[PDB]
Amino acid sequence: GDQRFGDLVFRQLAPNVWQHTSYLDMPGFGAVASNGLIVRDGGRVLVVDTAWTDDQTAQILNWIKQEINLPVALAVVTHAHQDKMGGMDALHAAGIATYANALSNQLAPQEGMVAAQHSLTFAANGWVEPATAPNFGPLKVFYPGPGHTSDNITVGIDGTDIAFGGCLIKDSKAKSLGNLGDADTEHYAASARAFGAAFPKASMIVMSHSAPDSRAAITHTARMADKLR
Numbered sequence: 001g002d003q004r005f006g007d008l009v010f011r012q013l014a015p016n017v018w019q020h021t022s023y024l025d026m027p028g029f030g031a032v033a034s035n036g037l038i039v040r041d042g043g044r045v046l047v048v049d050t051a052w053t054d055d056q057t058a059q060i061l062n063w064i065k066q067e068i069n070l071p072v073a074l075a076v077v078t079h080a081h082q083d084k085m086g087g088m089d090a091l092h093a094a095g096i097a098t099y100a101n102a103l104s105n106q107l108a109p110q111e112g113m114v115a116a117q118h119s120l121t122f123a124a125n126g127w128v129e130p131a132t133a134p135n136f137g138p139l140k141v142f143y144p145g146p147g148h149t150s151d152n153i154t155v156g157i158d159g160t161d162i163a164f165g166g167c168l169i170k171d172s173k174a175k176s177l178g179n180l181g182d183a184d185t186e187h188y189a190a191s192a193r194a195f196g197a198a199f200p201k202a203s204m205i206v207m208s209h210s211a212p213d214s215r216a217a218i219t220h221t222a223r224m225a226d227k228l229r
């Protein structure tokens with residue numbers, strides 16, 4: 001049930017969860033979809049990832065205002081690339097507190113992104129140190145290890161069957177791992193399986209560049225990454 005709002009698409013995945021989708025169309029390539037998440041947590045909203053641009057991201061906020069009409073308490077962004085952090089200024093202009101992997105905030109200047117206002121750090125088991133993720137509610141943030149990028153993180157939603165792989169995970173029928181220019185080819189496979197292991201009850205796997213899929217997305221992504229070692 002896709003809901004069109006301006007140039008963006010919103011799809012409800014759970015009573016309190018929506019996928020947001022925005023498009024970037026360059027010459028010599030088809031328009032590229034990028035997906036993030038919107039979560040209503042009681043009387044507030046949480047966002048995972050910006051759209052490609054400030055204008056699109058402001059439209060995400062406008063849709064939230066129209067359909068949910070509750071404050072957006074925070075956003076977490078899942079690595080320092082345009083499809084995940086291209087709209088940071090729109091979030092800050094709206095007064096929304098922003099969070100990213102410390103490494104993402106480190107990379108953001110060079111990558112041409114505005115850094116998030118707060119840095120997450122991670123324990124050795126990969127789970128976010130909770131003292132760096134205040135008031136994340138049902139958002140369970142996990143660093144699976146380097147893969148699509150060295151800084152990519154992932155997000156599960158407590159109370160749902162949903163885990164978000166961002167650009168790390170591709171769908172079960174994908175024909176490649178996408179752009180590998182910033183990838184960690186040696187560690188990608190372990191990182192994909194680490195993501196699955198951290199959210200073992202998740203039956204709906206959401207990702208950046210395909211529609212939601214079964215856990216076969218994890219096994220297939222990892223099996224493709226095995227070929228990079």
Ligand SMILES: O=C(Nc1nnn[nH]1)[C@H](Nc1ccccc1)c1ccccc1
Pocket residue numbers: 024032081082083148167168177178179180181208209
């Ligand atoms: O996001 C993407 N690819 C992806 N995501 N996850 N795995 N591959 C898109 N491809 C791409 C192209 C060149 C360099 C890096 C990525 C894209 C990103 C940014 C601007 C335009 C297009």
Ligand SMILES: [Zn+2]
Pocket residue numbers: 079080081148149167
């Ligand atoms: Zn990326």
Ligand SMILES: [Zn+2]
Pocket residue numbers: 081083167208209
């Ligand atoms: Zn991507």
